[PDB]
Amino acid sequence: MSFYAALIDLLGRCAPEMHLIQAGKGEALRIRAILRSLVPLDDLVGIIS
Amino acid sequence: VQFLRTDDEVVLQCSATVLKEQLKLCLAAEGFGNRLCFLEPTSNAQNVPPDLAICCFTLEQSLSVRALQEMLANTVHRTLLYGHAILLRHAHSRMYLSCLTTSRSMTDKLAFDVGLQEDATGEACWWTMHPASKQRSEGEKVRVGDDLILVSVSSERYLHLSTASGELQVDASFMQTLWNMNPICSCCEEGYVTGGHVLRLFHGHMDECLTISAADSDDQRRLVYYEGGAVCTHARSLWRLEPLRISWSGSHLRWGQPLRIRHVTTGRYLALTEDQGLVVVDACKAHTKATSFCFRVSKEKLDTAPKRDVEGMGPPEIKYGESLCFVQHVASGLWLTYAAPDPKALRLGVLKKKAILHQEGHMDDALFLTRCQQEESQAARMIHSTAGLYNQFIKGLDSFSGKPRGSGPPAGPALPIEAVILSLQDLIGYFEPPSEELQHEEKQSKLRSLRNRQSLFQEEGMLS
Amino acid sequence: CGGERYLDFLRFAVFVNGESVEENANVVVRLLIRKPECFGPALRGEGGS
Amino acid sequence: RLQESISDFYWYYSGKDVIEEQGKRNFSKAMSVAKQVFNSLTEYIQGP
Amino acid sequence: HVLDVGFLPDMRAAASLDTATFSTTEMALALNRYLCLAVLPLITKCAPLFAGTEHRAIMVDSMLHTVYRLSRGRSLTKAQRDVIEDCLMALCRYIRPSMLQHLLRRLVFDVPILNEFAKMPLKLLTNHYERCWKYYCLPTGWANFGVTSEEELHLTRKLFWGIFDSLAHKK
C-alpha cells in the first residue's frame, strides 16, 4: 500500500496549478487529461471508503 | 528523388509478427461512414489484391514544433526532416488523419483511437516524426524506405499496432511501433497516365467507351460490354489501374507493364476465367495469372520479354488523349476486341457489343485513355461503399425478417446501426443545397455540381 | 520498498514551497507515462487488478 | 545546427511585438558565433 | 464522500482516555478538513449529517487524546465555516451542541460555541427563518450566560470583549 500511496501522491503533486488551467496553457490540460485517464475517480472514492 | 518531399502520396506500412513468418499491413480508413482506421494486409497480394484506393495519404505540411505552435496560437515542397510535425490528408476523402478522444479496447493502457477529421483545425491532426534505431539523428533529413515512429501531439502517444484480443487493430498507445512511408507517387507530368488514376477507356472516336452492364440486369453485372452514348457521362465507364508493384504504384505507365483493371463502382477486377470469357471477377478469385493486363502500341511488333523494372518515378510515355494502344493478357497472351456475333434486327440495343478475348483480334480496337474528374471518382467510390453497406444492412434485416425473436435476439451478424446512421448523416450533408446568399455565378456552378452528383448517384441505384 | 524509496526523491523535485514547478513536473510525467512498468503490477495495463 | 537554433528562437519570438533585453542579448551572442563560423568557412575557400 | 467520511470519528474518535496510540486520525483531520472547507455545497436541503456536525463539534470541544492547538485551530476554522455556510435547516442541531455553553457558560473551551451562536443571528436575523421552541430557550440561555459573567470569577477584559453577544430578535 505504501508504494501505491507514494506514487499517487507524486502524481497529484505533478498536477498543474488551477490558475494555469483557467488561463489557457493547453499543455496543462493535456497533462491533466493524462492524469485523469491514468486513474478513474471511482478508484479514489473506493480508496477513501 | 527517393527523399520523401512535401506533397507526395504515401502509405503507412507496418510489420506484424503474429503470423508464423511475417505480415505486411498498410494503414487505411474508409472515410465517409466510418471515421476509424484499420490495417489492410498486403503481403498476400498473389491472389487477393489490396484496396489501395483508401490507403494513400498526402503530406500537406512539414513544419517544425515551434512553427506549428505559433500557427496554432495564431489561428483566426519542403524536404521532410526528423523531429518535424506533419499533417496527413486522406486521398479519397478530404479528411485529415488524427487521434480521436475515444477508446474501445477493454484495456485502457492510456490508449486512444486513431481516426479521421473533417477539418485540419485543431492540434490532434498533427504527428511528429522521431528517428528509429540510432542510424539517424534529430534534425537529419528523412529518406524513403526508412523505418520511423510517429508521435501524436494532442495525445503524446505512438501510432501503435495492438496485439490484443482483437485481430491486428491500430490505436494510439504508449507502446512503440515502427512504421515506414512508402512513396506512392511524386511530382507527376501533366497529361500522363499513371498507376491508380480512375479513367475511362475510349475506343476509336470520342463516342465509344469500354463500359459494363447497367444495374437491374439479367446477369450479375459480370458481362463486359462496349456501350456508347450517354454512358460516357455515368460512373459505369470508370475504371482504375492497379500495378502489381506496391511501393511506387503511382509511377508513369509503361508499355507492357502488367496491371489490373478494377471497376470502382462494383469492386470487381477484369479477368479471364477460361469458363465464360472476359468477365469481371471478385477480389478473392483475382490471381495474377488471370487478372493482369497491359497496354502496348504496335500490336504484333514481335513482342519481347519485358524487363528493367524502375525503382522511381520513371519517364512518362503514355499520354492522355493520344494513347492509341492495345490491351492483352500477359499470362496467356491473347488480345481483346468487339465481338458482334450477329447484327440482329431485334437486338434491343444501340451497340450491345460483348467484350471477348481472342488470340488475334479484329481491326480498329485500339483504346485511347481519358481521365475523369476527382469529384466523379470520389462519387463513384462513395457509391460503391454505400451500396455495399446498404446491401449488408438489407441482408442482415432479411436474415431475421422471418422468424420472431422469442429469445436470443441476435439471430446472426449484428446490424451496423451506428455505421448506417453515420453514413446516412454524411450523405444528407453531402447533398445539401447551396446557400441563397452566394453570388449568382458560383451558386449556379454549385447547383450544376450538385445536380451532376445526384444524377451520378441515381444512375447506379441508390434510389431503389 | 525500492519503488517507494525512489518515489520519495521525486516528490521534492516537483513540489517546492507548496507550489509546483511546471518543467520538472511535465518531464517527470512524460518519463513516467513512457515507461508503464513504474506504476506497479496493478496500474500497468491488460490483466491489471 | 546553429541556423536551426536561430530559426527556433525567431519562431518563439514571432508572436511578441517587441523583443525584450534578454532575448536581444542571446540573439547578439549567437550572431557573433555565427559570424565567426562564417569567417572560418570563407577562409577555407579564399585563395582558390 | 461526506457520508463516507462522516463515521470515521467514532465519538470524537474515542476522545476518552482509552488507548492514546492511534492519533493518525487527528493528523488526517488537518488534511481532509481543509478540502471540506474548500467547498460549501451543503446549503439547499437533504442534510441528514446533523450527527456529523455534532461529531465535529464534540471533536473540537473534546481534545483529551493528543491535544494539539495547531490542529485545534484548523478544527475551529472548520466548525466556523460550516456554521457560517449553512443554517436554519433544523432546531436541535444547534441547541444540542450549545447545551453545554448554556449550562457551563464559564468553560474555557466554549469560545467556539459562543462565536458560532453569535455569528448565526447577525447572518440570519430571523429573515427566511421561522422561530420554534429552540427560539424560546434563547432568553434563558442569554440570562444564564449573562448571570455567570459577573456573579463569580469576574471575567478579564480579553474574554469579556469577545463575550458581547448580540442578544437581538426580541418580542
PDB resolution in Å: 3.2
Q: How far apart are CA B463 and CA B461, in angstroms?
A: 5
Burial track A22-37 (b if 16+ CB lie within 10 A, e otherwise): eeeeeebebbeebbeb
Q: Which long-range contacts (CB under 8 A, 24 or more apart) does B229-236 make?
A: B229/B350, B232/B200, B232/B202, B232/B207, B234/B456, B234/B459, B234/B460, B235/B264, B235/B265, B235/B376, B235/B379, B235/B380, B235/B383, B235/B456, B235/B459, B235/B460, B236/B211, B236/B212, B236/B265, B236/B459, B236/B460
> Which E residues, 3 through 22, put their C-beta within 8 Å of a C-beta on chain A?
4-5
B299: nearest Cα among B364, B375, B234: B364
Chain E residues with CB-CB distance to A49 below 8 A: 4
C-alpha cell at B300: 504484333
CB-nearest to C40 from A4, A9, A34 is A4
Q: Residue B241: enclosing H or E segment and its boundaries?
A: strand B239-243
Q: Residue D29: enclosing H or E segment and its boundaries?
A: helix D21-43
Do D and C touch, 3+ Cβ pairs within 8 Å? The answer is: no
User: Does C5 contact B at CB distance below 8 Å?
Assistant: no
Q: After which residues is chain E broken (C to N over 2.5 A)?
A: none
Chain A residues with CB-CB distance to B110 below 8 A: 34, 37-38
Burial track D11-39 (b if 16+ CB lie within 10 A, e otherwise): bebeeeeeeeeeeeeeeeeeeeeeeeeee
Q: How far lies A14's CA from each of A44, B165, E140, in Å?
A: 17, 34, 55
Can you give the three-state secondary structure of B79-101, one letter per residue? ECECCCEEEEEECCCCCEEEEEC
Per 3-state DSSP, what percentage of chain D is helix, strand, and coil (rounded to 5)? 75, 0, 25
Q: How far lies B403's CA from each of B392, B397, E112, in Å?
A: 19, 11, 76
Structural Rg of chain A based on CA atoms = 12
Angle at CA of residue E63, ends E57 and E64, nearest 5°: 135
User: Does B70 contact D at CB distance below 8 Å?
Assistant: yes
Q: How far apart are CA D24 and CA D30, in angstroms?
A: 10
C-alpha cell at E113: 460555541
User: Does A13 contact C at CB distance below 8 Å?
Assistant: yes
Polymer length in residues for chain B: 464
DSSP B195-240: TT-EEEEEESSTTBB-EEPPSS-SS-S-BEE--BSGGGTSSTT-EE
- Given a contact cutoff of 8 angstroms between Cβ atoms, the answer to whether B39 and B14 are in contact is yes
Q: How far apart are CA B85 and CA B126, in angstroms?
A: 6
- CB pair distance less than 8 Å for A26 and B123: yes
Q: How far apart are CA B267 and CA B260, in angstroms?
A: 12
CA end-to-end span of chain B, whole Å? 49
Q: How far apart are CA E100 and CA E75, in angstroms?
A: 18
Which of B108, B121, B152, B173 is most worth mutating to test chain A (most A CB atoms within 10 A of its CB)? B108
Residues 6+ apart with CB under 8 A from B68: B85, B126, B153
Q: How far apart are CA B245 and CA B222, in angstroms?
A: 26
Distance between B279 CA and the closest CA of chain D, angstroms:
59
Which of B70, B102, B152, B156 is most worth mutating to test chain A (most A CB atoms within 10 A of its CB)? B156
Residue B220: CB atoms within 10 A of its CB come to 11
C-alpha cell at B188: 507527376
What does residue B128 show for φ and ψ, rounded to 5 degrees? -100, 125
Please name the amino acid found at residue B69. Q
Report the Cα E46 to chain-centroid distance in Å: 21
Q: How far apart are CA E103 and CA E140, in angstroms?
A: 10
Residue E105: CB atoms within 10 A of its CB come to 18
B78: nearest Cα among B90, B64, B62, B94: B62
Q: Which long-range contacts (CB under 8 A, 24 or more apart) does B114-117 make?
A: B114/B36, B114/B37, B114/B159, B114/B170, B114/B171, B114/B172, B115/B29, B115/B35, B115/B36, B115/B37, B116/B29, B116/B31, B116/B35, B116/B37, B116/B90, B117/B35
Which of A43, A47, A48 is most worth mutating to test chain E (most E CB atoms within 10 A of its CB)? A48
Which of B64, B65, B66, B79 is most worth mutating to test chain D (most D CB atoms within 10 A of its CB)? B66
Q: How far apart are CA B243 and CA B223, in angstroms?
A: 23
CB-nearest to B164 from C33, C34, C46 is C46
Q: How far apart are CA C44 and CA B459, in angstroms?
A: 55
Q: How far apart are CA B373 and CA B198, in angstroms?
A: 8
User: Does C32 contact B at CB distance below 8 Å?
Assistant: no
- CB pair distance less than 8 Å for A15 and C28: no
Beta bridge partners of B126: B87
- Given a contact cutoff of 8 angstroms between Cβ atoms, the answer to whether B338 and B358 are in contact is no
- Given a contact cutoff of 8 angstroms between Cβ atoms, the answer to whether B296 and B365 are in contact is no
Q: After which residues is chain C broken (C to N over 2.5 A)?
A: none
- CB pair distance less than 8 Å for C40 and A7: yes
Residues 6+ apart with CB under 8 A from B260: B49, B241, B242, B243, B244, B269, B270, B286, B291, B292, B293
B198-203 and C15-16 beta bridge pairing: unpaired
C-alpha cell at B366: 485500339
Sign of CA dihedral B282, B285, B287, B289: negative
Quick check: helix, strand or coil at residue B423? helix
Q: How far apart are CA D36 and CA B431, in angstroms?
A: 63
Sign of CA dihedral B405, B409, B411, B414: positive
Q: How far lies A34's CA from each of A47, B72, B177, D23, in Å?
A: 20, 21, 20, 33
Q: How far apart are CA C29 and CA C14, in angstroms?
A: 10
User: Does A47 contact C at CB distance below 8 Å?
Assistant: no
> Which D residues, 1 through 48, put their C-beta within 8 Å of a C-beta on chain B?
1, 4, 7-8, 11-12, 14-15
- Given a contact cutoff of 8 angstroms between Cβ atoms, the answer to whether B244 and B269 are in contact is no
Q: How far apart are CA E76 and CA C28, in angstroms?
A: 38
Using CB atoms, list chains with 3+ pairs below 8 Å to chain B: A, C, D
What does residue E19 show for φ and ψ, rounded to 5 degrees? -120, -50
Which runs of consecutive H residues, i.e. helices, occur in E39-137? Answer: 50-61, 69-85, 92-103, 111-124, 133-136
Angle at CA of residue B129, ends B125 and B132, nearest 5°: 150
Q: How far apart are CA B205 and CA E42, in angstroms?
A: 85
Q: How far apart are CA B291 and CA B303, in angstroms?
A: 20
CB-nearest to A37 from B108, B123, B154 is B108
Residue B296 DSSP class: E
Residue B37 DSSP class: E
- Given a contact cutoff of 8 angstroms between Cβ atoms, the answer to whether B389 and B32 are in contact is no
Residue D42: CB atoms within 10 A of its CB come to 9
Angle at CA of residue E127, ends E126 and E128, nearest 5°: 110
Residues 6+ apart with CB under 8 A from B42: B13, B24, B25, B26, B50, B246
Q: How far apart are CA B304 and CA B296, in angstroms?
A: 12
